[PDB]
Amino acid sequence: ESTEFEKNQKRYQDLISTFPHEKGWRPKEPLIEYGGYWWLPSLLEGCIHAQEFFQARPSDFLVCSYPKTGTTWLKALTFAIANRSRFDDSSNPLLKRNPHEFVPYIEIDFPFFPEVDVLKDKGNTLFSTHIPYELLPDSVVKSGCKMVYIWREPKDTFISMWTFLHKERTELGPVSNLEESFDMFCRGLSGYGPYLNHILAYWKAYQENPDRILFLKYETMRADPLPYVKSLAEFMGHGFTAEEEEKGVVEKVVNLCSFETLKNLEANKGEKDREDRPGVYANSAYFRKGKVGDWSNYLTPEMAARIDGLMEEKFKGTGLLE
Ligand SMILES: Nc1ncnc2c1ncn2[C@@H]1O[C@H](COP(=O)(O)O)[C@@H](OP(=O)(O)O)[C@H]1O
């Protein structure tokens, strides 16, 4: 009657209890270092579990991101693309439920909510994670399963994250202030951080096996979504036919999965939350503003310049700026 996670939880807690701990973004919530990256304690226990128990298949398809870079969007797009033969846009399930219900996290749903329907359906091939490339379950890497990675301009990412954290259901305390939070982010003391190292390891992975990994960028998709959605569909093995294109199927998929559509659904309003298992966020927390450039409403020019420089120092000559 205990799940596999529950049977192993005490040993996971013992294990991580001696990993280095640093002050985090809430007073009762330290960050814990594993594999050169920093973690929330729960998410680290999930990651350890995934590492020990998750069994990927070659036909699986993994959505990979650092948080707040476009994960919910990609979840909607991937689900919509793979299932479009089943559903008209007007009766698609993404109209009634938050996209996170359709694409389970290997470090959150797998360990903590293994009884969700999607995880019992061997017909499901869609999964997500924020686990850094270097720390992925050995099964994932060995299966050869295809991956899509998304990243985002770091100022907007930080602001997406800092605002979002105000909305968490938690008794571990309020989030640190803007300046302390940003300092921590810049030092790489963030969940799944350092952000810039997260990106670079997947980017290296891509360069080594560009057939296996599709690298996407929030701002690029946001400004010109059609080519990238077609690219994604093709990479998934669900490319759009000439017939679908001329009947405007691609636009229908883009519209369904758009910020404006998703934000304005009853399912995603107010305090409404997921129906499959307990969330610590309301669905609405996932849709804030959906813009490029919102950092300028929050960060000083001095803060902006610090992170821009950090990015240009880390990525110069990698191809990521170029
Ligand atoms: N369908 C969509 N299209 C574009 N952006 C979306 C989106 N759904 C959510 N977002 C935005 O993507 C960010 C969340 O990323 P994640 O899904 O990785 O947690 C938030 O950015 P903002 O906080 O800038 O509004 C959110 O509003």
Numbering used by the authors: 26 to 347
From the article:
They catalyse the transfer of a sulfuryl group from the co-substrate 3′-phospho- adenosine 5′-phosphosulphate (PAPS) to a hydroxyl group of various substrates.
Several atomic positions occupied by the polar groups of sinigrin in the AtSOT18•PAP•sinigrin complex, including the sulphate moiety, are filled with solvent molecules in the AtSOT18•PAP complex structure. Our mutagenesis study showed that the disturbance of these interactions leads to a dramatic loss of enzymatic activity. This seeming contradiction is resolved by our AtSOT18•PAP complex structure, where the oxygen positions of the sulphate moiety are occupied by the oxygen atoms of ethylene glycol. The solvent oxygens in AtSOT18•PAP complex occupying the place of the sulfuryl group in the AtSOT18•PAP•sinigrin complex are very stable and have excellent electron density and low B-factors. The main contribution to the PAPS binding energy is thus provided by the PAP nucleotide moiety, which binds to a deep hydrophobic pocket between helices α3, α13 and α16, and the 3′-phosphate group. PAP is deeply embedded within the structure and stabilized by several hydrogen bonds and π-π stacking with surrounding amino acids. The four oxygen atoms of the 3′-phosphate group form six hydrogen bonds with the side chains of Arg177, Ser185, Arg313, and the main chain of Lys314 and Gly315. The oxygen atoms of the 5′-phosphate group make six hydrogen bonds to the side chains of Lys93, the main chain of Gly95, and both the main and the side chains of Thr96 and Thr97. The adenyl moiety of PAP is stabilized by hydrogen bonds with Cys282 and Tyr243, the stacking interaction with Trp98, and the hydrophobic contacts with Phe284 and aliphatic groups of Arg247.
